[model samples]
Target chain A: MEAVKTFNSELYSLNDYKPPISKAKMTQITKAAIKAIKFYKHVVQSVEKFIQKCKPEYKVPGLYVIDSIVRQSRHQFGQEKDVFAPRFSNNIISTFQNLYRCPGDDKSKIVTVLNLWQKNNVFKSEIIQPLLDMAAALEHH
Target chain B: PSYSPTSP
Candidate 1:
């Protein structure tokens, strides 16, 4: 067989990841993350656009309701670092916890998604904060 | 495109 696919394979498991995470694989993760951030920006834009398209009667309260959602998204994508950092962290340990899960014996497995997680969070806040400011202007009218 | 709550 040319190649087989399975989570047990090196790519799927983080049992072998070391400090550096090597260069080529790290580059792949970086590119994937940047691509994801761009996609996320579009998703945020679409949501804002959708709200703009809502019926005028529904728009004001809809905007108000989503304001919290948007701000939460901002913190999740960035500001959460203050509460938990200098180690794998997220909104909290309750969910999306980025703590390492590798078993002690597994020196061969590695994990690389954490860096991407932080990068995507920061990019999302950048995309949403301005959009929300515009929404505030809409709210005033 | 399909929904299946029980499917794995």
Candidate 2:
């Protein structure tokens, strides 16, 4: 319980910035996220709530956290695949959809992460294509 | 792909 609370605090720190969070800071949070999952259960739910509750400007940073967790889960930590893969993929999709509803948020950053996920095959094409299409459609509007 | 959400 205490560990989960600490993880939640780390996630909330993403809001300590505006948009265009530095790669250094993103990497820092990513390491912390990976550590959280290593030590505690329900880390994904903590992240999901972070995305749900974070400021609009920090949503992209939230996605960065998710992206790293997904990658490490699949590649480095096979045991964690069950925790992160399909479950957090759904969270990623839902978070992207929520970000789309906010007109003033950074669409390009959102697209960039979605593209990175696609490029790395982090999630399946069927899951990623819709998000890419959703972002593209918003730009065309 | 090998694990289910229901289990954990």
Best by DockQ: 2
For candidate 2, what is the TM-score?
0.75
Please, what are the lDDT tens digits per residue for candidate 1 over residues A58-127? 2222222223223333445655532122111222221111111223222111111222333445224443
Candidate 2, CAPRI quality class derived from DockQ: incorrect
TM-score of each: 0.25, 0.75
Lowest-lDDT window of 10 residues in candidate 1 chain A? A92-101
Candidate 1 regions exceeding 4 Å error are A1-38, A80-141, B1-8
All-Cα superposition RMSD per candidate:
19.8, 7.6
lDDT of 2 by residue, A56-99 (tens): 76666677677766665676667445467677766667777776
Q: How far does residue A20 in candidate 2 sit from its true spot (Å)?
A: 3.2
Fnat per model, in the order shown: 0.00, 0.00
